[PDB]
């Protein structure tokens, strides 16, 4: 039982570590993008009517 549970936890850790490495840069640049994009889209939308 102990060996089997340890093997599964190790696999889970490996998977989480690989994801953290790639998600951290995207979350940090999100808020400036969303705000710049929304302002851009609203400005563009006012020229079509």
């Amino acid at each position: 039982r102990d060996l089997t549970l340890l093997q599964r936890e190790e696999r889970l850790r490996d998977l989480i570590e690989k994801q953290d490495e790639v998600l951290t840069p995207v979350v940090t640049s999100k808020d400036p993008f969303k705000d710049n994009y929304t302002t851009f889209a609203t400005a563009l939308d006012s020229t079509r009517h």
């Binding site: 039982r1 089997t4 549970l5 599964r8 889970l12 998977l15 989480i16 994801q19 563009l44 020229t47």
Partner: protein, 55 residues
């Protein structure tokens, strides 16, 4: 002995359920798709920067 085997199985299944959103291929696949759609859109916007600026 039989109780012990089934108890282990239960414990394993419980661990898998609790971590499925971040680990299972199904859920990870859905996140990929959403990200690819946005990429393509941004590529397009960057390609038409001049026209959009003029407008």
């Amino acid at each position: 002995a039989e109780i012990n085997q089934k108890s282990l199985e239960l414990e394993l299944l419980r661990l898998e359920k609790e971590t499925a959103d971040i680990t299972h291929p199904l859920y990870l696949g859905q996140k990929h798709q959403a990200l690819q759609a946005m990429n393509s859109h941004l590529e397009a916007v960057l390609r038409e920067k001049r026209s959009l600026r003029q407008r």
